[PDB]
Amino acid sequence: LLHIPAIFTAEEVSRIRAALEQAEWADGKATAGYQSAKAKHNLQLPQDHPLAREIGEAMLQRLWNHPLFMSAALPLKVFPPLFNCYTGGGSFDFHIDNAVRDVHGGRERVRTDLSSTLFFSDPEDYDGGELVIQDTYGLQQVKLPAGDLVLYPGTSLHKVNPVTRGARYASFFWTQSLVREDSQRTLLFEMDQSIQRLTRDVPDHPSLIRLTGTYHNLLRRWSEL
Amino acid sequence: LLHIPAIFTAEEVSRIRAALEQAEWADGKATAGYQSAKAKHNLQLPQDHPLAREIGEAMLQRLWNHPLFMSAALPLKVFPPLFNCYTGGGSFDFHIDNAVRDVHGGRERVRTDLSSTLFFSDPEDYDGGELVIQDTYGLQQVKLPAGDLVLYPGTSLHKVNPVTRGARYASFFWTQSLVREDSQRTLLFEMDQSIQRLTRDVPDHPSLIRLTGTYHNLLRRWSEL
Amino acid sequence: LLHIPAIFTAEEVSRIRAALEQAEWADGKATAGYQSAKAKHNLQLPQDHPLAREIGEAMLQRLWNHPLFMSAALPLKVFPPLFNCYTGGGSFDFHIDNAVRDVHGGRERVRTDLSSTLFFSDPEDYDGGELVIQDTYGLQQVKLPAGDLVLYPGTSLHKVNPVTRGARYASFFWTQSLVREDSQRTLLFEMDQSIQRLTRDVPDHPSLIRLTGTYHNLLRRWSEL
Amino acid sequence: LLHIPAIFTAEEVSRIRAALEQAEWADGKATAGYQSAKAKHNLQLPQDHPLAREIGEAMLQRLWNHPLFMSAALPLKVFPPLFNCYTGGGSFDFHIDNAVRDVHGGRERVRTDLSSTLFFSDPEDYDGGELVIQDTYGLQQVKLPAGDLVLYPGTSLHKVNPVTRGARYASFFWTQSLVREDSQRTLLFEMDQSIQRLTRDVPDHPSLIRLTGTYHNLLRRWSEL
Amino acid sequence: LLHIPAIFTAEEVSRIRAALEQAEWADGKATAGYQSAKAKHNLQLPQDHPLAREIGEAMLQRLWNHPLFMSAALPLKVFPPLFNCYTGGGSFDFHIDNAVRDVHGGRERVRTDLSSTLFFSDPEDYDGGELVIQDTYGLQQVKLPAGDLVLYPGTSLHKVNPVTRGARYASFFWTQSLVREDSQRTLLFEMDQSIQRLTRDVPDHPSLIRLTGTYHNLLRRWSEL
Amino acid sequence: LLHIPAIFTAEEVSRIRAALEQAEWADGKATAGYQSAKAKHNLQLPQDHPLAREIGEAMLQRLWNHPLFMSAALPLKVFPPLFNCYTGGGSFDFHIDNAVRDVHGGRERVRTDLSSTLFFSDPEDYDGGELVIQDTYGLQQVKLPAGDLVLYPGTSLHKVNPVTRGARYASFFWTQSLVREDSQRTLLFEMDQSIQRLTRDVPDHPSLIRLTGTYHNLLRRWSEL
């Protein structure tokens, strides 16, 4: 799990949450097939609601210009972000995301390599509502400050606990990475961090260009696009 | 070889075949390059003939909504269906399909993972014309009722026997699957039928969600798009 | 990080630890290459020590008959277990395990797909000594009850904190799995657990034999031996 | 499904069957696991039976000298052949073969890439006893002349129908190929046959040496050993 | 390195060079990210300069209809060709190309499997300016006649030596191949040349269709699109 | 083509060549199979020759302790070195090496990932005898000083030109690498050189241990053993 903070500033988050608080919400089951629909009991904006289209586009521009998201996710496709609200006991029980998610009836299709939640509500403003991620050998609970993003592989079973007080607004989306295998992405991420550290401490060292070549030749071997 | 019956109803097949019988046909060697053109001796509609465009689109809408085709083929791209007529001795001797088929000057290009024939003529309405498929260790002959589709891997050498009486009308196309390797697709197909059977017999069993998670993680590992 | 408890019984662990307390120890910088030897400040038994070979053989027999270890590790090769002691400030600073470890006497070489530590000391009897495993975006600290084993991928930088009070006795080793990729092993492990759960609940269901066939076909696709 | 005829001569087959007719048989439920032993209702020779070891060695010598078996199977390991008898209603209901079979003595483990049955009984001499191999979209039944072998991928559920009259004697085994994937083995097999055909027809052609290099380069890319 | 001569005729090269000589040149550092920009000291046309768009399109059509380029490169994407000029000491020190190059801010993104330079200056018309390609085990210097193309893998470190007299005009671009691995591309290229040679010497041989089938099944196995 | 000089000292080379000059030689066609034997017109020592086994063991001990050979070849298996003599017009026309070579004593089989020739004769002492290696787009000729080794991928057609004056003595062998793919091996080799250069210039840099971890994780991903 990668926590990427402050995608939006505090004033931006306040503006976005105010619009979400005043939006006309629809039943969340519309974007789930008949299976995980049994587990989904929240509210969602329609995909092409103008607020969802506007903030989704704003999220994409921020993420494509975030060095941490670019390095760790190596994004190729970002599914148009969806917006949900858990309140009044709303929840999303344990489910796996579909391997391929269609956009506008299959115009674009996104392999769900990575999943993400961007929190638009303060953790003090709702009870429950934790994003619970279950791996093979353990569980992780995530409840981040408003404006922060969590990034985790699409291979995990996850759920959102019921919200028992207040309301939780967030955006969620999937990313198809250039690099499908998470162990390969993390290897590239760690190697890039090492190269960045060496560039600061000892720039102009001839081994840096060759290690950069190694990094990009790995990307050549592994990138699908 | 997968036989998918009744893509169209009997009344629809009668309408489609009547239009095909009244269409203006061209020499089939147009679509074949100067290698398999020596083996191709049939009639074909031009690719953008309005009948070929109309029934091709109707064909895609039915196939995209057919659970058997969706599960077995896992389609990503469907080449715009071509339409042919074997009559008066027309035939297509043994040939292999090109690995990549270009659409409209290469705007889209389809890797020919799977081949398909949709029969529009009754088997009783023509002699010969069998679709003969030769794998490494044997041969299969296919002559299906009108409205039925045959699906088979693009890796095989195949031919159409001469038509010595009547006329054989059919559509043919290739599919680029999300999953390139046939053994991977069949594993996924078999797994899905097992999960479908368990959902019927014992729904809400907690292992069903996890096996569905397994299926989609395999699709996540194997899907190219 | 998989926790496999009670490899040995509490009585057995006491006998093993008592023997290790009376053993003659060697400087740990004899079995790590000169580089990781800079980070190594602990005690180790020589690989030809009879006590190390005796306990190591007992560990192998237990592990090769342990369903949890067999399923999660899918072992092909197990490097002969080594035994270390951390006491009086002894530690092992951060290091990466060599990808291929040669076994004394030639012949065998083990790809270090999985790492493991079997704890022989009670956690309350020593201070510090935690096994710290560095992830891409996380730290994990491990200090398990005596007789328990931790299994983790060999792809991680790890270390052992200094033991300030008491002594920490343990065995460590590496495993070459049939399945190299950790994401594949966990997928197989999860699938097997789901099948056992279904086998208990609804036996003789025809989907069990087919899903078992799916499991072994995946093992057939992925196993290297 | 590849049929390899006349591994042994007719005279040899009569001697082998006569010896097997006079041998002391054991219950077949001693070689397969619990799940498969439920489906197993036949007779088998113990793996240390001298007749099984003598005939099995004779099978290995013939198979390793057989150009057809060598090319289509590309064998790396052959599991020591086993011998069974189906008579008096004996059968082996549907089952899948374990992906990895351990050889007595502990040292060797065979990935079951390919399955094989060598028939020692005349098909006219017994009723039933068909080897039924279940495909994704088909069923294949095999009942071959005495002395003939069938070679087929280990990825299929298969069974043997009850023998209602007479007795069916056969040998079965598994092969770990150099080339794990069946589509790769068939590609190599077809390519080698084409080269041999060209070698007979137009020898000394400079493209023969280069295509042979292509064949071995593919074997270099795909062979695991 | 593949040398493909006479992409353009002598008269066409003269016309193109005259326009390049009269064009308004900009600093090259624009296309170089902040890294290789320290190594880039030449002149480039803006990407959408009408001369760059016109000749890039003209190169595009010539290459798509060139049998040597189609077979060796197996192109899927061609980055819109860039145009540079080295003069007055201009050079490009050692650098590695980025694995993924974006077109117009990411509408299309090209994996840089292959790199290419098309020379528009006569070697006699400038001093220095050699394209130097450093492999693991050696260096190659390329300085080709005007109108000729060089094709080489994108995995190499390369540079252009300073031009100390005259001026060097050229176009450069990258190609994403259908087949990512260079060893797979060369195997296909060599095998295609063998099949072409056999078709000339002995056409209508039944092994040619099967080897062509082998070639296309390899392309089916390896092509990404 | 990697050139590894001075496997033996000049004094050692003189003793080795002096022994080979006095040894009893055999027809080279006994080793190579037909087709390759058609192109083989040289002398070779039998594999049970004591001089071949003595020098061969000396080569193995030197190579296994040579950092350059260890890094570039990443050897898993080395085929017992063979010894040949070219003189009086003796030659070896173009040929590919078999992908899998069996070692005489049974048991071991070597995938011929890499080829090598150790020169025991001074290049001035014989005319001709060049080792010609044919690439996809070029030819390389090798005639190295006595005691030097050439290492090159096993994927190439190669030959030895006739020796018209003098005699050429050499040892040749194949290596199965831990890493099958040549592009992977060179990537690892280049990465290791970059790490070693950095280790000398800026030791104790925290990026060195992490980059070493990256190297071994790549080795963990790619090594087959």
mmCIF file of all heavy atoms in Angstrom, chain E residues 125-157:
data_model
loop_
_atom_site.group_PDB
_atom_site.id
_atom_site.type_symbol
_atom_site.label_atom_id
_atom_site.label_comp_id
_atom_site.label_asym_id
_atom_site.label_seq_id
_atom_site.Cartn_x
_atom_site.Cartn_y
_atom_site.Cartn_z
ATOM 1 N N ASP E 125 30.091 15.818 -47.019
ATOM 2 C CA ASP E 125 29.686 17.194 -46.765
ATOM 3 C C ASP E 125 29.817 17.602 -45.301
ATOM 4 O O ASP E 125 29.473 18.738 -44.961
ATOM 5 C CB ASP E 125 28.241 17.420 -47.236
ATOM 6 C CG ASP E 125 28.146 17.616 -48.740
ATOM 7 O OD1 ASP E 125 29.065 18.235 -49.316
ATOM 8 O OD2 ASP E 125 27.157 17.157 -49.348
ATOM 9 N N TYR E 126 30.297 16.720 -44.425
ATOM 10 C CA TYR E 126 30.540 17.122 -43.048
ATOM 11 C C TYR E 126 31.622 16.239 -42.443
ATOM 12 O O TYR E 126 31.813 15.092 -42.846
ATOM 13 C CB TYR E 126 29.263 17.072 -42.198
ATOM 14 C CG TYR E 126 28.642 15.699 -42.047
ATOM 15 C CD1 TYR E 126 28.858 14.936 -40.902
ATOM 16 C CD2 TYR E 126 27.811 15.176 -43.032
ATOM 17 C CE1 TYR E 126 28.278 13.686 -40.749
ATOM 18 C CE2 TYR E 126 27.225 13.927 -42.885
ATOM 19 C CZ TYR E 126 27.467 13.188 -41.744
ATOM 20 O OH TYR E 126 26.891 11.949 -41.589
ATOM 21 N N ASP E 127 32.330 16.804 -41.473
ATOM 22 C CA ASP E 127 33.405 16.135 -40.760
ATOM 23 C C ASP E 127 32.914 15.790 -39.360
ATOM 24 O O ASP E 127 32.163 16.558 -38.749
ATOM 25 C CB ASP E 127 34.655 17.012 -40.714
ATOM 26 C CG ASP E 127 35.540 16.825 -41.931
ATOM 27 O OD1 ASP E 127 35.030 16.337 -42.974
ATOM 28 O OD2 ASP E 127 36.729 17.186 -41.853
ATOM 29 N N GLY E 128 33.340 14.633 -38.849
ATOM 30 C CA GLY E 128 32.778 14.165 -37.592
ATOM 31 C C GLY E 128 31.345 13.693 -37.782
ATOM 32 O O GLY E 128 30.972 13.148 -38.822
ATOM 33 N N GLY E 129 30.531 13.894 -36.750
ATOM 34 C CA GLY E 129 29.120 13.587 -36.859
ATOM 35 C C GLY E 129 28.769 12.120 -36.963
ATOM 36 O O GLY E 129 27.647 11.790 -37.363
ATOM 37 N N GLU E 130 29.690 11.223 -36.614
ATOM 38 C CA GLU E 130 29.390 9.801 -36.673
ATOM 39 C C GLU E 130 28.376 9.425 -35.602
ATOM 40 O O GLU E 130 28.438 9.904 -34.465
ATOM 41 C CB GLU E 130 30.656 8.961 -36.488
ATOM 42 C CG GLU E 130 31.707 9.121 -37.572
ATOM 43 C CD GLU E 130 32.637 10.288 -37.317
ATOM 44 O OE1 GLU E 130 32.344 11.098 -36.413
ATOM 45 O OE2 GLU E 130 33.667 10.387 -38.014
ATOM 46 N N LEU E 131 27.438 8.562 -35.973
ATOM 47 C CA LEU E 131 26.551 7.938 -35.000
ATOM 48 C C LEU E 131 27.303 6.777 -34.364
ATOM 49 O O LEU E 131 27.602 5.781 -35.032
ATOM 50 C CB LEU E 131 25.260 7.480 -35.669
ATOM 51 C CG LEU E 131 24.335 6.559 -34.867
ATOM 52 C CD1 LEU E 131 23.858 7.224 -33.587
ATOM 53 C CD2 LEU E 131 23.151 6.146 -35.728
ATOM 54 N N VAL E 132 27.629 6.909 -33.083
ATOM 55 C CA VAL E 132 28.421 5.917 -32.363
ATOM 56 C C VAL E 132 27.491 5.127 -31.455
ATOM 57 O O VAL E 132 26.786 5.708 -30.623
ATOM 58 C CB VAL E 132 29.546 6.579 -31.554
ATOM 59 C CG1 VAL E 132 30.354 5.520 -30.815
ATOM 60 C CG2 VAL E 132 30.444 7.404 -32.474
ATOM 61 N N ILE E 133 27.497 3.807 -31.605
ATOM 62 C CA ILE E 133 26.610 2.913 -30.868
ATOM 63 C C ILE E 133 27.474 1.984 -30.026
ATOM 64 O O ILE E 133 28.283 1.222 -30.570
ATOM 65 C CB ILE E 133 25.704 2.111 -31.814
ATOM 66 C CG1 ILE E 133 24.835 3.060 -32.644
ATOM 67 C CG2 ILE E 133 24.846 1.125 -31.029
ATOM 68 C CD1 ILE E 133 24.196 2.412 -33.854
ATOM 69 N N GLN E 134 27.302 2.039 -28.707
ATOM 70 C CA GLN E 134 28.088 1.238 -27.775
ATOM 71 C C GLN E 134 27.240 0.083 -27.262
ATOM 72 O O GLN E 134 26.218 0.302 -26.603
ATOM 73 C CB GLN E 134 28.585 2.077 -26.596
ATOM 74 C CG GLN E 134 29.641 1.372 -25.753
ATOM 75 C CD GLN E 134 30.684 2.323 -25.202
ATOM 76 O OE1 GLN E 134 31.073 3.285 -25.860
ATOM 77 N NE2 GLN E 134 31.158 2.045 -23.994
ATOM 78 N N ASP E 135 27.672 -1.140 -27.552
ATOM 79 C CA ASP E 135 27.036 -2.328 -27.009
ATOM 80 C C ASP E 135 27.728 -2.738 -25.710
ATOM 81 O O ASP E 135 28.556 -2.008 -25.156
ATOM 82 C CB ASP E 135 27.057 -3.464 -28.029
ATOM 83 C CG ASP E 135 25.775 -3.553 -28.831
ATOM 84 O OD1 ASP E 135 24.969 -2.600 -28.775
ATOM 85 O OD2 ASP E 135 25.571 -4.580 -29.512
ATOM 86 N N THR E 136 27.380 -3.925 -25.213
ATOM 87 C CA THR E 136 28.063 -4.476 -24.049
ATOM 88 C C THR E 136 29.536 -4.730 -24.343
ATOM 89 O O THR E 136 30.396 -4.519 -23.479
ATOM 90 C CB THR E 136 27.377 -5.772 -23.611
ATOM 91 O OG1 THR E 136 25.964 -5.667 -23.824
ATOM 92 C CG2 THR E 136 27.652 -6.068 -22.147
ATOM 93 N N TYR E 137 29.847 -5.178 -25.560
ATOM 94 C CA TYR E 137 31.174 -5.674 -25.887
ATOM 95 C C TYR E 137 31.885 -4.905 -26.995
ATOM 96 O O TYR E 137 32.988 -5.308 -27.386
ATOM 97 C CB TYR E 137 31.089 -7.157 -26.276
ATOM 98 C CG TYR E 137 30.289 -7.992 -25.298
ATOM 99 C CD1 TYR E 137 29.238 -8.789 -25.734
ATOM 100 C CD2 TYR E 137 30.566 -7.961 -23.937
ATOM 101 C CE1 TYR E 137 28.495 -9.547 -24.844
ATOM 102 C CE2 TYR E 137 29.833 -8.718 -23.039
ATOM 103 C CZ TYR E 137 28.798 -9.508 -23.498
ATOM 104 O OH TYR E 137 28.066 -10.258 -22.604
ATOM 105 N N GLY E 138 31.312 -3.822 -27.512
ATOM 106 C CA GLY E 138 32.004 -3.069 -28.546
ATOM 107 C C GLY E 138 31.246 -1.823 -28.953
ATOM 108 O O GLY E 138 30.125 -1.566 -28.500
ATOM 109 N N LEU E 139 31.890 -1.049 -29.827
ATOM 110 C CA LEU E 139 31.341 0.173 -30.398
ATOM 111 C C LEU E 139 31.277 0.065 -31.915
ATOM 112 O O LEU E 139 32.140 -0.551 -32.548
ATOM 113 C CB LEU E 139 32.182 1.401 -30.034
ATOM 114 C CG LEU E 139 32.267 1.901 -28.597
ATOM 115 C CD1 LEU E 139 33.446 1.273 -27.878
ATOM 116 C CD2 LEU E 139 32.418 3.410 -28.631
ATOM 117 N N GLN E 140 30.256 0.691 -32.494
ATOM 118 C CA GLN E 140 30.105 0.777 -33.939
ATOM 119 C C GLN E 140 29.899 2.231 -34.335
ATOM 120 O O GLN E 140 29.122 2.948 -33.698
ATOM 121 C CB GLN E 140 28.927 -0.074 -34.424
ATOM 122 C CG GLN E 140 29.286 -1.521 -34.703
ATOM 123 C CD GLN E 140 28.126 -2.464 -34.462
ATOM 124 O OE1 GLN E 140 27.639 -2.593 -33.339
ATOM 125 N NE2 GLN E 140 27.678 -3.136 -35.518
ATOM 126 N N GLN E 141 30.600 2.663 -35.381
ATOM 127 C CA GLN E 141 30.441 3.996 -35.947
ATOM 128 C C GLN E 141 29.714 3.898 -37.279
ATOM 129 O O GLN E 141 30.096 3.099 -38.141
ATOM 130 C CB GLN E 141 31.790 4.690 -36.148
ATOM 131 C CG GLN E 141 32.467 5.145 -34.870
ATOM 132 C CD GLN E 141 33.635 6.071 -35.141
ATOM 133 O OE1 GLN E 141 34.121 6.161 -36.270
ATOM 134 N NE2 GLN E 141 34.087 6.773 -34.108
ATOM 135 N N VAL E 142 28.681 4.720 -37.448
ATOM 136 C CA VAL E 142 27.837 4.702 -38.636
ATOM 137 C C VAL E 142 27.844 6.090 -39.262
ATOM 138 O O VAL E 142 27.600 7.090 -38.575
ATOM 139 C CB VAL E 142 26.400 4.259 -38.300
ATOM 140 C CG1 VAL E 142 25.529 4.269 -39.544
ATOM 141 C CG2 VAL E 142 26.407 2.882 -37.662
ATOM 142 N N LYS E 143 28.130 6.148 -40.562
ATOM 143 C CA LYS E 143 28.050 7.393 -41.323
ATOM 144 C C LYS E 143 27.726 6.997 -42.762
ATOM 145 O O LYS E 143 28.631 6.670 -43.535
ATOM 146 C CB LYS E 143 29.350 8.179 -41.218
ATOM 147 C CG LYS E 143 29.311 9.587 -41.782
ATOM 148 C CD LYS E 143 30.604 10.326 -41.428
ATOM 149 C CE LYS E 143 30.687 11.686 -42.096
ATOM 150 N NZ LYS E 143 31.787 12.520 -41.523
ATOM 151 N N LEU E 144 26.442 7.032 -43.110
ATOM 152 C CA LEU E 144 25.927 6.409 -44.319
ATOM 153 C C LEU E 144 25.660 7.436 -45.407
ATOM 154 O O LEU E 144 25.542 8.635 -45.136
ATOM 155 C CB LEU E 144 24.636 5.639 -44.010
ATOM 156 C CG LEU E 144 24.753 4.462 -43.042
ATOM 157 C CD1 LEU E 144 23.377 3.882 -42.723
ATOM 158 C CD2 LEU E 144 25.686 3.393 -43.594
ATOM 159 N N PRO E 145 25.566 6.994 -46.664
ATOM 160 C CA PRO E 145 25.208 7.918 -47.745
ATOM 161 C C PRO E 145 23.831 8.525 -47.525
ATOM 162 O O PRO E 145 22.960 7.929 -46.888
ATOM 163 C CB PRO E 145 25.229 7.026 -48.994
ATOM 164 C CG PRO E 145 26.168 5.918 -48.639
ATOM 165 C CD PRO E 145 25.915 5.659 -47.181
ATOM 166 N N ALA E 146 23.653 9.738 -48.044
ATOM 167 C CA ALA E 146 22.373 10.421 -47.929
ATOM 168 C C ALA E 146 21.264 9.595 -48.572
ATOM 169 O O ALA E 146 21.426 9.052 -49.667
ATOM 170 C CB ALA E 146 22.453 11.803 -48.578
ATOM 171 N N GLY E 147 20.133 9.501 -47.879
ATOM 172 C CA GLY E 147 19.026 8.672 -48.308
ATOM 173 C C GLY E 147 18.982 7.295 -47.678
ATOM 174 O O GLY E 147 17.958 6.613 -47.798
ATOM 175 N N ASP E 148 20.052 6.874 -47.008
ATOM 176 C CA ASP E 148 20.115 5.558 -46.385
ATOM 177 C C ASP E 148 19.684 5.618 -44.927
ATOM 178 O O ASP E 148 19.858 6.630 -44.241
ATOM 179 C CB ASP E 148 21.527 4.976 -46.475
ATOM 180 C CG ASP E 148 21.939 4.663 -47.894
ATOM 181 O OD1 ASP E 148 21.184 5.014 -48.823
ATOM 182 O OD2 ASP E 148 23.015 4.059 -48.082
ATOM 183 N N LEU E 149 19.122 4.508 -44.458
ATOM 184 C CA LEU E 149 18.634 4.372 -43.096
ATOM 185 C C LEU E 149 19.485 3.363 -42.338
ATOM 186 O O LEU E 149 19.951 2.376 -42.914
ATOM 187 C CB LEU E 149 17.172 3.923 -43.088
ATOM 188 C CG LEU E 149 16.463 3.875 -41.735
ATOM 189 C CD1 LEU E 149 15.581 5.099 -41.543
ATOM 190 C CD2 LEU E 149 15.654 2.597 -41.612
ATOM 191 N N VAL E 150 19.695 3.619 -41.051
ATOM 192 C CA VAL E 150 20.257 2.636 -40.132
ATOM 193 C C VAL E 150 19.178 2.271 -39.120
ATOM 194 O O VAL E 150 18.396 3.127 -38.690
ATOM 195 C CB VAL E 150 21.540 3.149 -39.446
ATOM 196 C CG1 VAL E 150 21.251 4.351 -38.550
ATOM 197 C CG2 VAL E 150 22.206 2.029 -38.659
ATOM 198 N N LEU E 151 19.095 0.984 -38.793
ATOM 199 C CA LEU E 151 18.130 0.458 -37.835
ATOM 200 C C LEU E 151 18.895 -0.320 -36.775
ATOM 201 O O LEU E 151 19.706 -1.187 -37.113
ATOM 202 C CB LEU E 151 17.102 -0.445 -38.535
ATOM 203 C CG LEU E 151 16.008 -1.149 -37.722
ATOM 204 C CD1 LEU E 151 15.015 -0.154 -37.150
ATOM 205 C CD2 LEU E 151 15.284 -2.175 -38.582
ATOM 206 N N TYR E 152 18.652 -0.013 -35.506
ATOM 207 C CA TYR E 152 19.377 -0.668 -34.427
ATOM 208 C C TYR E 152 18.498 -0.707 -33.188
ATOM 209 O O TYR E 152 17.578 0.108 -33.047
ATOM 210 C CB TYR E 152 20.713 0.038 -34.140
ATOM 211 C CG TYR E 152 20.611 1.500 -33.764
ATOM 212 C CD1 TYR E 152 20.740 1.907 -32.442
ATOM 213 C CD2 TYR E 152 20.411 2.476 -34.733
ATOM 214 C CE1 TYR E 152 20.660 3.242 -32.092
ATOM 215 C CE2 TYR E 152 20.325 3.813 -34.394
ATOM 216 C CZ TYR E 152 20.454 4.190 -33.071
ATOM 217 O OH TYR E 152 20.375 5.515 -32.725
ATOM 218 N N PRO E 153 18.742 -1.652 -32.277
ATOM 219 C CA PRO E 153 17.882 -1.777 -31.092
ATOM 220 C C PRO E 153 17.966 -0.559 -30.185
ATOM 221 O O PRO E 153 19.004 0.098 -30.072
ATOM 222 C CB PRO E 153 18.424 -3.027 -30.387
ATOM 223 C CG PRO E 153 19.179 -3.772 -31.440
ATOM 224 C CD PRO E 153 19.753 -2.723 -32.338
ATOM 225 N N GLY E 154 16.844 -0.267 -29.529
ATOM 226 C CA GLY E 154 16.764 0.848 -28.615
ATOM 227 C C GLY E 154 17.444 0.635 -27.286
ATOM 228 O O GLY E 154 17.411 1.524 -26.432
ATOM 229 N N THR E 155 18.070 -0.523 -27.090
ATOM 230 C CA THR E 155 18.692 -0.888 -25.825
ATOM 231 C C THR E 155 20.131 -0.407 -25.697
ATOM 232 O O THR E 155 20.755 -0.647 -24.659
ATOM 233 C CB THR E 155 18.653 -2.411 -25.646
ATOM 234 O OG1 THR E 155 19.387 -3.035 -26.708
ATOM 235 C CG2 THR E 155 17.221 -2.919 -25.663
ATOM 236 N N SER E 156 20.676 0.254 -26.713
ATOM 237 C CA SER E 156 22.084 0.620 -26.732
ATOM 238 C C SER E 156 22.285 2.072 -26.321
ATOM 239 O O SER E 156 21.419 2.926 -26.529
ATOM 240 C CB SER E 156 22.687 0.401 -28.123
ATOM 241 O OG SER E 156 22.204 -0.792 -28.718
ATOM 242 N N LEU E 157 23.443 2.340 -25.726
ATOM 243 C CA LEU E 157 23.886 3.709 -25.504
ATOM 244 C C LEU E 157 24.516 4.229 -26.789
ATOM 245 O O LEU E 157 25.354 3.552 -27.396
ATOM 246 C CB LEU E 157 24.888 3.765 -24.349
ATOM 247 C CG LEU E 157 24.916 5.031 -23.490
ATOM 248 C CD1 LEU E 157 23.856 4.970 -22.407
ATOM 249 C CD2 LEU E 157 26.296 5.230 -22.877
#
